[PDB]
């Protein structure tokens, strides 16, 4: 049946080429021989035998079989290399996690500068990401590594969220010890920079806000290579962490250790004056220092910016493609 995963062989897919390498193994683009459906294959190598099957892959298998949303990427099946006959021990073949193939990734579109986003385009993109993020946050799962490198887009304007390698469950009643360096520094929440280690679902909201600003400027809002330089950049725009705006900032492990140059005032509305007023208010709330005062995913859906956006109108982003292939005289 369709449910008996791990038996069907990778022979059934015709490989087109390699499209990435991260977390555990390389990602390949393939076409199903039987159906002709494009798929993406994550090779999962257990040959290391230090800890066997990668736990990053285990999380992505466990969560993505539970999660069903148009804004979350689908795992169609898992398929295997031709296995050694009668030799289960000798067998070192790898598994392939079969995903739906998405046309592009947001980073490459912004990096090549080949993508222009209008206000309406930005709405559809964010509305789907939130629809996905809300669905996940409602199921008590946290993505914990939101990045432009893993927001995926089809030419139709359909967005899906993808890298669930670090995703884990969140219990409100029983806060659990967690891993502090969870979201990448450019999209890291202030709370994690200061050692929170007990994160809320808000951490994923902060990243999406950074993306929101990144959709209007086409540049990540906060870019740094050091955990304290990031805090400085965030502090200049969002204001320096202080007990007045963040009552429980003192409880954080590295609040005294990590201090910004000054006690900067909040300038977000001024520096983003060019953003529309409806998005600017959304950014102000998503980029709130205190996680308890930071808006939720649903609240972003209930904003003047996103509530009345319609799924029927895809509003695909514009790609010049051939037009700009040749230099414009």
């Amino acid at each position: 049946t369709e449910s008996d995963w791990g038996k069907r062989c990778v022979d059934k897919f015709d490989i087109i080429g390699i499209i990435g390498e991260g977390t555990y193994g390389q990602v390949y683009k393939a076409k199903d021989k039987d159906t002709g459906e494009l798929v993406a294959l994550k090779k999962v190598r257990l040959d290391n035998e230090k800890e066997g099957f990668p736990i990053t892959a285990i999380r992505e298998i466990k969560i993505l079989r539970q999660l069903i949303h148009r804004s979350v990427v689908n795992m169609k099946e898992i398929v295997t290399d031709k296995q050694d006959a009668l030799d289960f021990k000798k067998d070192k073949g790898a598994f392939y996690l079969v995903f739906e193939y998405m046309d592009h990734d947001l980073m490459g579109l912004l990096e090549s500068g080949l993508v222009h986003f209008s206000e309406d385009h930005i709405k559809s993109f964010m509305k789907q990401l939130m629809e996905g993020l809300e669905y996940c946050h409602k199921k008590n799962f946290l993505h914990r590594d939101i990045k432009c490198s893993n927001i995926l887009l089809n030419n139709s304007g359909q967005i899906k969220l993808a890298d669930f390698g670090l995703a884990r469950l969140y219990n409100s009643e029983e806060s659990r010890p967690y891993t502090n360096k969870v979201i990448t520094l450019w999209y890291r929440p202030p709370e994690l920079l200061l050692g929170e280690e007990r994160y809320t679902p808000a951490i994923d909201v902060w990243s999406c806000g950074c993306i929101l600003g990144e959709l209007f400027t086409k540049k990540p809002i906060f870019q740094a290579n050091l955990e304290l330089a990031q805090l400085e950049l965030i502090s200049r725009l969002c204001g320096s962490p202080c007990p007045a705006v963040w009552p429980d900032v003192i409880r954080l492990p590295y609040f005294n250790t990590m201090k910004p140059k000054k006690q900067y005032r909040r300038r977000l509305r001024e520096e983003f004056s060019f953003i529309p007023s409806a998005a600017l208010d959304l950014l102000d709330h998503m980029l709130t220092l205190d996680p308890s005062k930071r808006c939720t995913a649903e609240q972003t859906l209930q904003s003047d910016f996103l509530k009345d956006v319609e799924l029927s109108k895809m509003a695909p982003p514009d790609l010049p493609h051939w037009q700009d292939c040749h230099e414009l005289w």
Partner: protein
């Protein structure tokens, strides 16, 4: 790691902008001409242009305006680089010695902002109170010109109008007033603001907003006698000043877009307008005085004077001389005369300045068999299209072959003693239902001619609607003699067929040498073309014969001969064709993991693919199996303009952001993963858009030439006309030269106090990185021009390494010899 060397053989020839002012002295009249990364100072005389000085900057000049603040004897100059480096410069001459003083310096880049669609706009107040900069949409930046602002500190004023087309400071206002055209969903409008330095904000402007032409392009600040502003559009010219409003819509301007304006009469009675077809107009302001004595504008009139070059910027040089700043063709000095000649023109060309224009493609050919390469370049566009033959005659000798149409690709067929050139010309839908060419050109002046009769796409479905006056491109293949450079044959391609690729080669066991062209059928509705042809021609006995045609489902962006087989890229696909004994192309193997396979290069059985967004992929043809194999891909997102293979392990790429990078196989076979990872070992900001990489060197080879430390030679052409050479170094020589750069950086004075490292840093909007693996030949070759005290200061504590001696002290004379050997490569 990889080590490479980049040198500029020919400096940029295109003109980015021009202003005229009293920079050197109030007594002198000066024309300041700007070419990318270069500043040229001249003193204008009625006899001609005399160059006083030529300066180099560590930045692309974006804004350049001349201003004389009260208390200065001479005008000062503001310059803003594309990297947002700003500086104020002042002329200083002591006898024979000339220096340019950097009075103020600062980087105006903001942490958060959206680059404007129209780009950076820079203007200066008539009273020189402030410098206006619109670096980002929705923000207006003000640099106040106070004596104490030596760092050019500035503040931003929130601007409601997000999409601004153009802006200028106005004359005759009680407070500094900006007038600008902006665009919102309701059309385009003209609006005014007053800037309050005390309040650091806008105040209500002197006169109300007016709705203007949908394609309003340029804003003109008219001088004190009239006041107000003029707005130039596609079909109409309008004057605005409070209650006054005049609009003239002559039919002559509608034919071609006007993109430049310059003031002829200082009081504003005359302005010069130029258009993309090269016509030069004059906007005349007809004065009507009232008994009160108030001078008012009566009407506007436009008069055609003649033809000039397509001007990005114009300048009137007093007397009657006008400098035409051209980015697409040769710039010019022209005098506007009072009497027309017998042809009806008031314009007669005086001086002509060579501009290699946009170099779309180029090939290196040894025409005279003298062991020396000649670079024949596809240069210019439209009427300025030309073939330029360049040799290292010591100065560079450049011969020009006028084409009067746009050249696209060039290839050389020695067997036929001729060049094959792809060209496109602009015709316009006429009343006959067909199209008519604006002027005769190479494709219409060929000795013999032919037109494709292919029936492949003839059926189609139904013809798309055509409106009179619309432009269309007509593509041709030109056969041009290598000695006379006369158009021997012109083959016109099918209607709505765009030619993109051209090769000359033998295939398979076929002894005939063919011209092969790859085309795409472009329909306006198609985002990406889905029809194309690979056509095989044979040039024999003065006639071009259609030998075979292959129908493809896309655009044949690039083709290259691959060991007797034809390698072609059709959209996302890279394909290998075999040439059968029946003289027909036959597919062999394909690769489909690309977005748009724009560029192809081959060495042996290895193929290098450049992609619109996925950077460079190294492919391999496996002959045992008859199919392609992916060797290694660059996984960093880069938008390619051209690629080249330096050696079996190093591959060179050019980015649309004016950056160059080198990728090498990770040469570590531990994991298949590492081999598949191409690693960007070299990053370098060139400052130029590289359209074509071509192996070869123009230097004379007598077989006696001392073997230079540099090995290999890749020439590249750019859109601003610059020609450069990329060559490799040994690790020992790179370190020696790199250590020397760091010593030169502290010694040589930079204009604008711009750090050299920042200028050459790989820069994209999202990421900024330091240069690596590249030696700036220009910085090194300047060692021979610095004074002796500086030379000895540079060589202090210098040790050669990895050579015959592990540590060797360097003398100033030793390096002079070394650098002089490096100057022999170009």
């Amino acid at each position: 790691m990889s080590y490479n060397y980049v040198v500029t053989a020919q400096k940029p020839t295109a003109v980015n902008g021009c202003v005229t002012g009293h920079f050197t002295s109030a007594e002198d009249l000066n024309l300041l001409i700007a070419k990318n990364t270069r500043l040229e100072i001249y003193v204008v005389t009625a006899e001609g242009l005399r160059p006083v000085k030529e300066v180099g900057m560590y930045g692309k000049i974006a804004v350049m305006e001349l201003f004389r603040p009260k208390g200065e004897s001479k005008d000062l100059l503001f310059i803003l680089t594309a990297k947002y480096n700003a500086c104020i410069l002042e002329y200083k001459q002591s006898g024979e010695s000339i220096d340019i003083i950097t009075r103020a310096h600062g980087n105006v880049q903001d942490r958060i902002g959206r680059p404007s669609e129209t780009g950076i706009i820079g203007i200066i107040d008539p009273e020189c109170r402030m410098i206006g900069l619109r670096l980002y949409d929705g923000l207006f930046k003000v640099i106040p010109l106070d004596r104490d602002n030596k760092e050019l500190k500035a503040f931003n004023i929130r601007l409601e109008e997000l999409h601004v087309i153009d802006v200028k400071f106005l004359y005759g206002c009680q407070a500094p007033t900006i007038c600008f055209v902006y665009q919102d969903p309701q059309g385009r409008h003209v609006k005014t603001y007053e800037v309050s330095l005390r309040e650091k904000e806008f105040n209500k402007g002197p006169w109300k907003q007016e709705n203007v032409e949908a394609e309003a392009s340029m804003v003109i600040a008219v001088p004190e006698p009239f006041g107000g502003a003029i707005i130039i559009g596609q079909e109409s010219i309008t004057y605005h000043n409070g209650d006054k409003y005049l609009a003239i819509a002559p039919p002559i301007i509608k034919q071609s877009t006007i993109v430049c304006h310059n003031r002829v009469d200082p009081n504003g009675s005359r302005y010069l307008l130029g258009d993309m077809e090269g016509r030069l107009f004059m906007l005349l302001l007809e004065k009507e005085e009232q008994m009160d004595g108030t001078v008012t504008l009566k009407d506007l009139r436009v008069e055609l004077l003649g033809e000039t070059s397509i001007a990005e910027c114009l300048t009137y040089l007093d007397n009657g001389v006008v400098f035409v700043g051209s980015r697409l063709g040769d710039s010019q000095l022209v005098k506007l005369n009072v009497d027309s000649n017998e042809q009806g023109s008031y314009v007669v060309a005086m001086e002509t300045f060579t501009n290699l224009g946009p170099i779309v493609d180029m090939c290196v050919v040894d025409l005279e068999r003298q062991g020396q390469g000649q670079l024949v370049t596809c240069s210019g566009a439209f009427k300025e299209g030309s073939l330029r033959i360049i040799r290292n005659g010591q100065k560079l000798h450049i011969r020009t072959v006028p084409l009067y149409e746009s050249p696209r690709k060039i290839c050389y067929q020695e067997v036929s003693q001729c060049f094959g050139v792809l060209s496109s010309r602009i015709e316009v839908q006429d009343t006959s239902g067909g199209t008519t060419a604006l002027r005769p050109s190479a494709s219409t002046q060929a000795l013999s001619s032919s037109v494709s009769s292919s029936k492949l796409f003839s059926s189609s479905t139904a013809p798309h609607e055509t409106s009179f006056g619309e432009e269309v491109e007509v593509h041709n293949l030109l056969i041009i003699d290598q000695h006379t450079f006369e158009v021997l044959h012109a083959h016109q391609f099918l209607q709505n067929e765009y030619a993109l690729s051209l090769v000359s080669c033998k295939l398979g066991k076929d002894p005939n040498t063919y011209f092969i062209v790859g085309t795409a059928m472009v329909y306006p509705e198609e985002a990406e073309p889905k029809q194309g042809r690979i056509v095989v021609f044979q040039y024999s006995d003065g006639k071009l014969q259609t030998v075979a045609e292959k129908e493809v489902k896309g655009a044949v962006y690039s083709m290259v001969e691959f060991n007797g087989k034809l390698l072609a890229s059709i959209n996302s696909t890279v394909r290998l064709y075999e040439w059968t004994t029946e003289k027909e192309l036959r597919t062999e193997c394909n690769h489909y993991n690309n977005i748009m396979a724009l560029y192809l290069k081959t060495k042996g059985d290895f193929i290098l693919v450049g992609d619109l967004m996925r950077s460079v992929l190294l492919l391999a043809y496996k002959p045992m199996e008859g199919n392609f194999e992916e060797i290694a891909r660059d996984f960093n997102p880069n938008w390619m303009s051209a690629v080249e293979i330096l050696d079996d392990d190093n591959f060179l790429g050019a980015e649309n952001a004016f950056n160059l990078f080198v990728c090498q196989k990770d040469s570590a076979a531990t994991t298949d993963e590492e081999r598949q990872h191409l690693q960007e070992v070299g990053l370098f900001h060139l400052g130029e858009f590289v359209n074509v990489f071509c192996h070869g060197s123009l230097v004379m080879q007598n077989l006696g030439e001392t073997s230079t430390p540099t090995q290999g030679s890749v020439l590249f052409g750019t859109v601003n006309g610059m020609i450069g050479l990329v060559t490799s170094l040994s690790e020992s020589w790179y370190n020696l030269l790199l250590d020397m750069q760091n010593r030169l950086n502290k010694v040589i004075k930079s204009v604008g106090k711009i750090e050299h490292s920042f200028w050459r840093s790989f820069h994209t909007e999202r990421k900024t990185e330091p240069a690596t693996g590249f030696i700036d030949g220009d910085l090194i070759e300047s060692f021979l021009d610095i004074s002796r005290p500086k030379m000895q200061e540079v060589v202090a504590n210098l040790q050669y390494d990895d050579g015959s001696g592990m540590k060797r002290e360097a003398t100033a004379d030793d390096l002079i010899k070394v650098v002089e050997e490096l100057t022999r490569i170009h």
